Short mmCIF file of C-alpha atoms and ligand atoms in Angstrom, two decimals:
data_model
loop_
_atom_site.label_atom_id
_atom_site.label_comp_id
_atom_site.label_asym_id
_atom_site.label_seq_id
_atom_site.Cartn_x
_atom_site.Cartn_y
_atom_site.Cartn_z
CA UNK A 7 2.99 -25.86 46.38
CA UNK A 8 4.11 -26.87 42.89
CA UNK A 9 7.27 -28.87 42.21
CA UNK A 10 9.39 -26.37 40.29
CA UNK A 11 12.60 -27.22 38.43
CA UNK A 12 15.94 -26.52 40.04
CA UNK A 13 16.98 -22.84 39.86
CA UNK A 14 20.33 -24.03 38.48
CA UNK A 15 18.71 -25.30 35.26
CA UNK A 16 15.84 -22.76 35.06
CA UNK A 17 17.04 -19.55 36.72
CA UNK A 18 13.60 -17.92 36.42
CA UNK A 19 12.59 -19.71 39.64
CA UNK A 20 15.17 -18.08 41.93
CA UNK A 21 14.03 -17.08 45.42
CA UNK A 22 12.94 -13.45 45.14
CA UNK A 23 15.44 -11.66 47.38
CA UNK A 24 16.70 -8.08 47.63
CA UNK A 25 19.75 -8.70 45.41
CA UNK A 26 17.60 -9.46 42.34
CA UNK A 27 14.35 -7.42 42.49
CA UNK A 28 12.92 -4.36 44.24
CA UNK A 29 9.23 -3.45 44.39
CA UNK A 30 7.43 -0.09 44.54
CA UNK A 39 -0.53 -6.19 41.72
CA UNK A 40 3.03 -5.20 42.63
CA UNK A 41 4.75 -2.36 40.78
CA UNK A 42 8.25 -3.23 39.56
CA UNK A 43 10.80 -0.64 40.68
CA UNK A 44 13.90 -2.53 39.53
CA UNK A 45 15.67 -5.84 39.27
CA UNK A 46 17.79 -8.07 37.11
CA UNK A 47 16.78 -8.74 33.51
CA UNK A 48 16.03 -12.34 34.52
CA UNK A 49 13.56 -11.13 37.15
CA UNK A 50 12.01 -8.65 34.70
CA UNK A 51 11.35 -11.45 32.21
CA UNK A 52 9.68 -13.56 34.90
CA UNK A 53 7.46 -10.63 35.92
CA UNK A 54 6.75 -9.90 32.24
CA UNK A 55 5.50 -13.49 31.87
CA UNK A 56 4.17 -14.03 35.39
CA UNK A 57 1.41 -16.64 35.57
CA UNK A 58 -0.44 -15.32 38.63
CA UNK A 59 -1.63 -12.10 36.95
CA UNK A 60 -1.71 -10.20 33.66
CA UNK A 61 -0.40 -6.62 33.65
CA UNK A 62 -0.82 -5.09 30.17
CA UNK A 63 0.61 -1.84 31.55
CA UNK A 64 3.85 -3.71 32.31
CA UNK A 65 3.99 -5.41 28.90
CA UNK A 66 3.44 -2.15 27.00
CA UNK A 67 6.08 -0.30 29.04
CA UNK A 68 8.64 -3.12 28.81
CA UNK A 69 8.47 -3.53 25.02
CA UNK A 70 8.66 0.26 24.61
CA UNK A 71 11.75 0.77 26.79
CA UNK A 72 13.60 -2.57 26.93
CA UNK A 73 16.22 -1.48 24.37
CA UNK A 74 17.84 0.75 27.02
CA UNK A 75 18.97 -2.33 28.98
CA UNK A 76 18.61 -5.37 26.67
CA UNK A 77 19.28 -6.15 23.02
CA UNK A 78 16.41 -7.43 20.84
CA UNK A 79 18.29 -10.68 20.19
CA UNK A 80 18.90 -11.05 23.93
CA UNK A 81 15.22 -10.49 24.74
CA UNK A 82 14.14 -13.22 22.32
CA UNK A 83 16.68 -15.57 23.92
CA UNK A 84 15.29 -14.92 27.41
CA UNK A 85 11.68 -15.45 26.28
CA UNK A 86 12.58 -18.72 24.55
CA UNK A 87 14.49 -19.77 27.68
CA UNK A 88 11.37 -18.85 29.66
CA UNK A 89 9.30 -20.99 27.27
CA UNK A 90 11.42 -24.17 27.36
CA UNK A 91 10.76 -25.05 31.00
CA UNK A 92 12.51 -28.31 32.00
CA UNK A 93 10.17 -30.32 34.19
CA UNK A 94 11.66 -32.22 37.14
CA UNK A 95 12.16 -35.97 37.09
CA UNK A 103 8.77 -41.66 36.09
CA UNK A 104 12.15 -42.61 34.62
CA UNK A 105 10.64 -45.91 33.47
CA UNK A 106 7.95 -43.93 31.63
CA UNK A 107 10.57 -43.15 28.97
CA UNK A 108 8.84 -43.92 25.62
CA UNK A 109 5.51 -42.99 27.23
CA UNK A 110 3.95 -39.90 28.84
CA UNK A 111 4.52 -39.11 32.50
CA UNK A 112 1.78 -38.47 35.06
CA UNK A 113 1.08 -37.43 38.68
CA UNK A 114 2.61 -34.15 39.89
CA UNK A 115 3.65 -33.16 36.35
CA UNK A 116 0.01 -32.56 35.39
CA UNK A 117 -0.28 -29.96 38.16
CA UNK A 118 3.03 -28.42 37.09
CA UNK A 119 1.87 -28.09 33.48
CA UNK A 120 -1.65 -26.80 34.16
CA UNK A 121 -0.78 -24.16 36.78
CA UNK A 122 2.70 -23.00 35.69
CA UNK A 123 3.85 -24.29 32.29
CA UNK A 124 0.63 -23.52 30.40
CA UNK A 125 0.02 -19.99 31.79
CA UNK A 126 3.68 -18.96 31.49
CA UNK A 127 3.90 -20.18 27.90
CA UNK A 128 0.64 -18.36 27.13
CA UNK A 129 2.02 -15.15 28.65
CA UNK A 130 5.05 -15.43 26.36
CA UNK A 131 2.92 -15.80 23.23
CA UNK A 132 1.02 -12.67 24.25
CA UNK A 133 4.38 -10.91 24.59
CA UNK A 134 5.33 -12.13 21.10
CA UNK A 135 1.96 -10.96 19.77
CA UNK A 136 2.31 -7.53 21.39
CA UNK A 137 5.90 -7.36 20.10
CA UNK A 138 5.20 -7.82 16.38
CA UNK A 139 1.99 -5.78 16.59
CA UNK A 140 3.35 -2.49 17.95
CA UNK A 141 7.13 -2.90 17.49
CA UNK A 142 7.56 -4.70 14.17
CA UNK A 143 10.41 -2.30 13.32
CA UNK A 144 12.62 -4.51 15.51
CA UNK A 145 12.10 -7.30 12.97
CA UNK A 146 12.51 -5.07 9.91
CA UNK A 147 15.95 -3.90 11.08
CA UNK A 148 16.97 -7.49 11.98
CA UNK A 149 15.83 -10.28 9.67
CA UNK A 150 17.53 -12.84 11.92
CA UNK A 151 15.26 -11.75 14.77
CA UNK A 152 12.24 -12.42 12.54
CA UNK A 153 13.64 -15.78 11.40
CA UNK A 154 14.10 -16.99 14.99
CA UNK A 155 10.57 -16.01 16.00
CA UNK A 156 8.95 -17.57 12.93
CA UNK A 157 11.00 -20.74 13.44
CA UNK A 158 10.05 -20.91 17.13
CA UNK A 159 6.36 -20.06 16.61
CA UNK A 160 6.09 -22.86 14.03
CA UNK A 161 7.24 -25.38 16.68
CA UNK A 162 4.76 -24.60 19.49
CA UNK A 163 2.46 -27.60 19.98
CA UNK A 164 -0.96 -27.52 21.61
CA UNK A 165 -4.58 -26.55 21.05
CA UNK A 166 -4.76 -23.71 23.58
CA UNK A 167 -1.71 -22.16 21.88
CA UNK A 168 -2.87 -22.83 18.31
CA UNK A 169 -5.00 -19.67 18.54
CA UNK A 170 -1.98 -17.58 19.55
CA UNK A 171 0.35 -19.14 16.96
CA UNK A 172 -2.06 -18.39 14.12
CA UNK A 173 -2.63 -14.87 15.48
CA UNK A 174 1.08 -14.01 15.55
CA UNK A 175 1.69 -15.41 12.06
CA UNK A 176 -1.31 -13.44 10.81
CA UNK A 177 0.12 -10.16 12.15
CA UNK A 178 3.53 -10.92 10.64
CA UNK A 179 1.94 -11.47 7.22
CA UNK A 180 -0.12 -8.27 7.44
CA UNK A 181 2.96 -6.29 8.47
CA UNK A 182 4.96 -7.72 5.56
CA UNK A 183 2.18 -6.66 3.17
CA UNK A 184 2.36 -3.13 4.60
CA UNK A 185 6.12 -2.69 4.17
CA UNK A 186 6.12 -4.08 0.61
CA UNK A 187 3.18 -1.84 -0.36
CA UNK A 188 4.05 1.37 1.51
CA UNK A 189 0.46 1.97 2.69
CA UNK A 190 -1.30 -0.24 5.26
CA UNK A 194 -7.62 6.76 4.05
CA UNK A 195 -11.27 7.04 5.09
CA UNK A 196 -12.75 10.48 5.83
CA UNK A 197 -16.17 11.91 6.67
CA UNK A 198 -16.78 15.03 4.53
CA UNK A 199 -13.56 16.81 3.53
CA UNK A 200 -13.63 20.46 2.40
CA UNK A 201 -12.64 21.54 -1.12
CA UNK A 202 -9.04 22.34 -2.03
CA UNK A 203 -8.23 26.04 -2.37
CA UNK A 204 -6.27 27.46 -5.31
CA UNK A 205 -4.86 30.94 -5.92
CA UNK A 206 -2.51 31.82 -8.82
CA UNK A 207 -0.93 28.39 -9.33
CA UNK A 208 -3.14 26.20 -11.49
CA UNK A 209 -3.23 22.51 -10.47
CA UNK A 210 -0.74 20.31 -12.29
CA UNK A 211 1.81 23.12 -12.83
CA UNK A 212 4.40 22.54 -10.10
CA UNK A 213 6.86 25.01 -11.65
CA UNK A 214 4.58 27.91 -10.64
CA UNK A 215 4.38 26.73 -7.02
CA UNK A 216 5.56 29.30 -4.47
CA UNK A 217 4.59 30.92 -1.18
CA UNK A 218 2.79 33.81 -2.89
CA UNK A 219 1.25 31.82 -5.77
CA UNK A 220 -0.36 29.01 -3.77
CA UNK A 221 -3.41 29.64 -1.61
CA UNK A 222 -2.56 30.44 2.04
CA UNK A 223 -5.39 28.21 3.27
CA UNK A 224 -4.14 25.23 1.27
CA UNK A 225 -0.50 25.89 2.23
CA UNK A 226 -1.38 25.47 5.91
CA UNK A 227 -3.61 22.47 5.16
CA UNK A 228 -0.95 20.55 3.22
CA UNK A 229 1.76 21.48 5.72
CA UNK A 230 -0.47 20.31 8.58
CA UNK A 231 -1.19 17.01 6.82
CA UNK A 232 2.51 16.47 6.09
CA UNK A 233 3.60 17.39 9.62
CA UNK A 234 0.83 15.16 11.00
CA UNK A 235 2.08 12.16 9.03
CA UNK A 236 5.66 12.83 10.17
CA UNK A 237 4.40 13.14 13.75
CA UNK A 238 2.43 9.87 13.65
CA UNK A 239 5.35 7.86 12.22
CA UNK A 240 7.41 8.63 15.35
CA UNK A 241 7.50 5.65 17.72
CA UNK A 242 7.92 6.04 21.49
CA UNK A 243 11.07 3.89 21.47
CA UNK A 244 12.78 6.56 19.35
CA UNK A 245 12.60 8.84 22.41
CA UNK A 246 13.83 6.34 25.03
CA UNK A 247 17.45 6.54 26.14
CA UNK A 248 18.11 9.74 24.15
CA UNK A 249 18.96 7.52 21.18
CA UNK A 250 18.38 10.42 18.76
CA UNK A 251 21.56 12.06 20.15
CA UNK A 252 23.84 8.99 20.06
CA UNK A 253 26.15 7.40 17.49
CA UNK A 254 23.38 5.43 15.73
CA UNK A 255 20.78 8.19 15.90
CA UNK A 256 19.90 7.71 12.22
CA UNK A 257 18.98 4.05 12.84
CA UNK A 258 17.45 4.38 16.31
CA UNK A 259 15.31 7.49 15.62
CA UNK A 260 14.78 7.89 11.86
CA UNK A 261 11.22 9.19 12.15
CA UNK A 262 12.01 11.58 15.01
CA UNK A 263 14.97 13.11 13.16
CA UNK A 264 12.93 13.39 9.96
CA UNK A 265 10.39 15.37 11.98
CA UNK A 266 13.16 17.64 13.29
CA UNK A 267 14.75 18.13 9.86
CA UNK A 268 11.36 19.15 8.45
CA UNK A 269 10.71 21.76 11.15
CA UNK A 270 14.16 23.28 10.61
CA UNK A 271 13.82 23.38 6.81
CA UNK A 272 10.35 24.96 6.89
CA UNK A 273 11.52 27.54 9.43
CA UNK A 274 14.42 28.50 7.15
CA UNK A 275 12.03 28.53 4.18
CA UNK A 276 9.89 31.16 5.92
CA UNK A 277 13.05 33.14 6.69
CA UNK A 278 14.26 32.77 3.10
CA UNK A 279 10.98 34.09 1.69
CA UNK A 280 11.02 37.18 3.92
CA UNK A 281 14.66 38.22 3.60
CA UNK A 282 14.94 37.61 -0.17
CA UNK A 283 12.03 39.98 -0.94
CA UNK A 284 14.25 43.01 -1.48
CA UNK A 285 11.41 45.32 -2.50
CA UNK A 286 9.77 46.77 0.61
CA UNK A 287 6.18 46.40 -0.60
CA UNK A 288 6.79 42.81 -1.73
CA UNK A 289 8.38 41.96 1.63
CA UNK A 290 5.37 43.32 3.54
CA UNK A 291 3.05 41.20 1.39
CA UNK A 292 5.14 38.07 2.05
CA UNK A 293 5.18 38.59 5.82
CA UNK A 294 1.44 39.30 5.78
CA UNK A 295 0.89 36.07 3.83
CA UNK A 296 2.87 34.16 6.46
CA UNK A 297 0.76 35.67 9.25
CA UNK A 298 -2.36 34.43 7.45
CA UNK A 299 -0.83 30.94 7.19
CA UNK A 300 -0.14 31.24 10.92
CA UNK A 301 -3.84 31.80 11.62
CA UNK A 302 -4.85 28.66 9.73
CA UNK A 303 -2.16 26.72 11.61
CA UNK A 304 -3.71 27.60 14.97
CA UNK A 305 -7.18 26.97 13.55
CA UNK A 306 -5.99 23.47 12.63
CA UNK A 307 -4.24 23.12 16.03
CA UNK A 308 -0.93 22.65 14.19
CA UNK A 309 1.39 23.85 16.93
CA UNK A 310 4.44 22.59 15.03
CA UNK A 311 3.68 24.88 12.10
CA UNK A 312 2.94 27.74 14.50
CA UNK A 313 6.40 27.46 16.06
CA UNK A 314 8.01 27.18 12.62
CA UNK A 315 6.65 30.65 11.86
CA UNK A 316 7.40 31.95 15.36
CA UNK A 317 10.97 30.66 15.12
CA UNK A 318 11.30 32.32 11.71
CA UNK A 319 10.21 35.75 12.97
CA UNK A 320 12.31 35.36 16.14
CA UNK A 321 15.53 34.84 14.16
CA UNK A 322 18.10 37.63 14.02
CA UNK A 323 17.48 38.01 10.28
CA UNK A 324 13.74 38.72 10.49
CA UNK A 325 13.24 40.24 13.96
CA UNK A 326 15.57 43.16 13.17
CA UNK A 327 13.33 44.33 10.29
CA UNK A 328 11.60 47.01 12.33
CA UNK A 329 10.35 48.99 9.33
CA UNK A 330 8.80 45.86 7.82
CA UNK A 331 6.78 45.00 10.94
CA UNK A 332 5.64 48.61 11.39
CA UNK A 333 4.20 48.58 7.86
CA UNK A 334 1.78 45.79 8.83
CA UNK A 335 -1.78 46.30 10.01
CA UNK A 336 -2.12 46.45 13.79
CA UNK A 337 -4.36 43.37 13.77
CA UNK A 338 -1.67 41.59 11.74
CA UNK A 339 1.00 42.45 14.32
CA UNK A 340 -1.26 41.60 17.26
CA UNK A 341 -1.88 38.08 15.95
CA UNK A 342 1.85 37.55 15.38
CA UNK A 343 2.75 39.16 18.71
CA UNK A 344 0.23 36.90 20.46
CA UNK A 345 1.83 33.84 18.85
CA UNK A 346 5.31 34.94 19.96
CA UNK A 347 3.96 35.70 23.45
CA UNK A 348 2.27 32.33 23.93
CA UNK A 349 5.41 30.53 22.70
CA UNK A 350 7.58 32.17 25.39
CA UNK A 353 6.49 27.63 26.52
CA UNK A 354 4.50 28.76 29.56
CA UNK A 355 1.34 29.52 27.57
CA UNK A 356 1.86 26.75 25.00
CA UNK A 357 0.97 24.17 27.67
CA UNK A 358 -2.35 25.84 28.50
CA UNK A 359 -3.55 25.92 24.88
CA UNK A 360 -2.52 22.32 24.18
CA UNK A 361 -4.20 21.02 27.36
CA UNK A 362 -7.64 22.27 26.26
CA UNK A 363 -7.90 21.38 22.56
CA UNK A 364 -8.88 18.00 21.14
CA UNK A 365 -7.35 16.01 18.27
CA UNK A 366 -6.67 16.33 15.37
CA UNK A 367 -3.56 18.13 16.64
CA UNK A 368 0.14 18.40 15.84
CA UNK A 369 2.04 19.16 19.07
CA UNK A 370 5.64 20.34 19.36
CA UNK A 371 8.26 17.66 20.01
CA UNK A 372 10.96 20.00 21.32
CA UNK A 373 9.35 20.49 24.72
CA UNK A 374 8.75 16.76 25.23
CA UNK A 375 12.33 16.01 24.17
CA UNK A 376 13.54 18.42 26.86
CA UNK A 377 11.46 16.70 29.55
CA UNK A 378 12.83 13.31 28.47
CA UNK A 379 16.46 14.45 28.21
CA UNK A 380 16.28 15.94 31.70
CA UNK A 381 14.71 12.70 32.96
CA UNK A 382 17.46 10.58 31.39
CA UNK A 383 19.96 12.68 33.35
CA UNK A 384 17.87 12.95 36.53
CA UNK A 385 17.83 9.20 37.20
CA UNK A 386 20.55 6.55 37.22
CA UNK A 387 20.23 3.58 34.88
CA UNK A 388 21.15 0.99 37.54
CA UNK A 389 20.02 0.55 41.13
CA UNK A 390 22.37 -1.11 43.61
CA UNK A 391 21.39 -3.25 46.61
CA UNK A 392 24.36 -5.23 48.02
CA UNK A 393 27.04 -4.55 45.44
CA UNK A 394 24.90 -6.07 42.66
CA UNK A 395 23.56 -3.68 40.04
CA UNK A 396 19.84 -3.94 39.25
CA UNK A 397 18.11 -2.49 36.20
CA UNK A 398 16.37 0.72 37.29
CA UNK A 399 12.97 0.10 35.71
CA UNK A 400 11.30 3.11 37.35
CA UNK A 401 13.40 5.39 35.13
CA UNK A 402 11.99 3.62 32.06
CA UNK A 403 8.41 4.00 33.33
CA UNK A 404 8.67 7.78 33.78
CA UNK A 405 10.06 8.21 30.26
CA UNK A 406 7.32 5.95 28.88
CA UNK A 407 4.66 8.20 30.43
CA UNK A 408 6.09 11.27 28.70
CA UNK A 409 5.92 9.42 25.37
CA UNK A 410 2.34 8.36 26.12
CA UNK A 411 1.12 11.91 25.55
CA UNK A 412 2.56 11.81 22.02
CA UNK A 413 0.62 8.68 21.01
CA UNK A 414 -2.52 10.37 22.38
CA UNK A 415 -2.58 12.99 19.61
CA UNK A 416 -1.49 10.49 16.93
CA UNK A 417 -4.77 8.54 16.98
CA UNK A 418 -7.14 11.02 15.34
CA UNK A 419 -6.38 12.08 11.74
CA UNK A 420 -7.23 15.30 9.90
CA UNK A 421 -10.31 15.53 7.68
CA UNK A 422 -8.43 17.28 4.88
CA UNK A 423 -7.74 16.22 1.31
CA UNK A 424 -4.11 15.70 0.27
CA UNK A 425 -2.81 17.53 -2.80
CA UNK A 426 -0.06 15.40 -4.38
CA UNK A 427 1.71 18.21 -6.26
CA UNK A 428 1.76 20.42 -3.16
CA UNK A 429 2.77 17.49 -0.94
CA UNK A 430 5.87 16.71 -3.00
CA UNK A 431 6.58 20.45 -3.23
CA UNK A 432 6.85 20.75 0.55
CA UNK A 433 8.49 17.33 0.94
CA UNK A 434 11.34 18.38 -1.37
CA UNK A 435 11.82 21.83 0.20
CA UNK A 436 15.57 22.44 0.57
CA UNK A 437 16.13 26.18 1.12
CA UNK A 438 19.75 25.64 2.19
CA UNK A 439 20.67 24.16 -1.19
CA UNK A 440 24.09 22.51 -1.04
CA UNK A 441 25.28 24.73 1.82
CA UNK A 442 25.19 23.84 5.51
CA UNK A 443 22.83 25.21 8.16
CA UNK A 444 25.18 27.77 9.71
CA UNK A 445 26.36 28.93 6.27
CA UNK A 446 22.76 29.60 5.20
CA UNK A 447 21.79 31.58 8.31
CA UNK A 448 24.84 33.80 7.79
CA UNK A 449 23.60 34.42 4.24
CA UNK A 450 20.21 35.39 5.68
CA UNK A 451 21.69 37.83 8.20
CA UNK A 452 23.87 39.41 5.51
CA UNK A 453 20.78 39.65 3.29
CA UNK A 454 18.92 41.30 6.17
CA UNK A 455 21.70 43.89 6.45
CA UNK A 456 21.23 44.59 2.72
CA UNK A 457 17.47 45.18 2.64
CA UNK A 458 17.37 47.09 5.96
CA UNK A 459 20.89 48.11 6.99
CA UNK A 460 21.88 49.23 10.46
CA UNK A 461 21.62 52.90 11.34
CA UNK A 462 22.63 55.44 10.16
CA UNK A 463 22.54 53.80 6.70
CA UNK A 464 19.92 55.06 4.26
CA UNK A 465 16.91 53.04 3.07
CA UNK A 466 17.98 51.07 -0.01
CA UNK A 467 16.06 51.13 -3.29
CA UNK A 468 14.98 47.76 -4.70
CA UNK A 469 12.53 47.38 -7.61
CA UNK A 470 9.45 45.18 -7.73
CA UNK A 471 10.70 41.81 -9.01
CA UNK A 472 7.42 39.87 -8.81
CA UNK A 473 5.74 39.27 -12.17
CA UNK A 474 2.37 38.51 -10.54
CA UNK A 475 -0.08 40.19 -8.19
CA UNK A 476 0.89 39.76 -4.53
CA UNK A 477 -2.62 40.48 -3.23
CA UNK A 478 -3.83 37.76 -0.87
CA UNK A 479 -7.04 35.83 -1.69
CA UNK A 480 -7.90 35.73 2.02
CA UNK A 481 -8.26 33.31 4.91
CA UNK A 482 -11.97 32.48 4.63
CA UNK A 483 -12.86 29.17 2.87
N1 QBC B 1 10.54 45.06 15.07
C1 QBC B 1 9.20 44.77 15.52
C2 QBC B 1 8.32 45.80 15.84
C3 QBC B 1 7.03 45.47 16.28
N2 QBC B 1 6.64 44.21 16.38
C4 QBC B 1 7.49 43.18 16.07
C5 QBC B 1 7.01 41.84 16.20
C6 QBC B 1 7.85 40.77 15.89
CL1 QBC B 1 7.26 39.10 16.05
C7 QBC B 1 9.15 41.02 15.45
C8 QBC B 1 9.62 42.32 15.32
C9 QBC B 1 8.76 43.42 15.64
#
């Protein structure tokens, strides 16, 4: 048995009772933040599953500055008191205390620091003081066994700083050629739904929605922080993914309802159905639901005469997409396809939101509240499926002019979201009014041929 310091001066060695930790290598069910730090840096074993889950979900019960304080407090272990050795090293039982407890614990902390800056460097971008403390502390760790960890952490910090100042941290195998229809490359003014190639529209939208999907970190989904006061700071990538799906859905609605001429409106809807087929060929389920949500809106769905003018095979494909999105059948298709894939966030957000409400944040033992860590583990497992599809990229070339075209898509203009949808429903009542109104007469406004080039590459 080692000679530990007093628990009054190093509270990480407090007798594990029921009022500080609850179990069910043991699985941590809950406990105080002091006990969680000790288990995070426990010397008797190494649980990477516990380090990954902690760093992903710790912000729901501990501030980043507070976590760095606890890890530094865990690092600066005061050894017990020999006294005459002052001005010289000490020996005997301190060698056993340093080799079996001090060295492994301090090595566990450096691995926590290394895993922190590697996968969660955004904590240090939002807080420069947090990065200054770590760099100041890392530069003071003495020892040869820790010199490999100190140089490794400082190397990651440098590489991360080079990535933020550059913007990019793009290797492919053989990418297919870029398709073009009426819009010649380099002429962004002629870019439109009916002038660009439907194959390339779905390709560029899949590549853009894939990049937005891969920038989303799991911590942006913990604690429902995207529906709180600081949602713009806590979930910037998740909200940017949501704002893109809403804008593209309204863009598909805007293209359909603003085609006043009947023949031109049938060509636009047919072009969208073709883009839908390439979306499901690319396993872009986000783009599929953008089109499904567009045709399910009150503005588009009420256009009975437009849908009946389509080919039966055109309607069947669209009806199949609306059927499978009802999301009972969306789970079967996603659980059978391999990456590259762009899944739909909205169903995972629902499973997380209902889990945040289905479990209490704090367990209680004897009047002392413990941090319910099991709630954080279940949420972390829902986010684990998202990172699964983010690993593999798409083997598709990026078109810069088309990328910026879809990045800057703002169909609402300066109006709000509810104001724009009312404009779409009023426009739908103009092109196909309610019965018993007569069919209106609108002339062909397109100055170019609306015939589709096709879906085959
Ligand atoms: N009015 C309609 C008639 C037939 N099929 C339709 C399919 C969708 Cl997706 C929306 C409206 C329809």
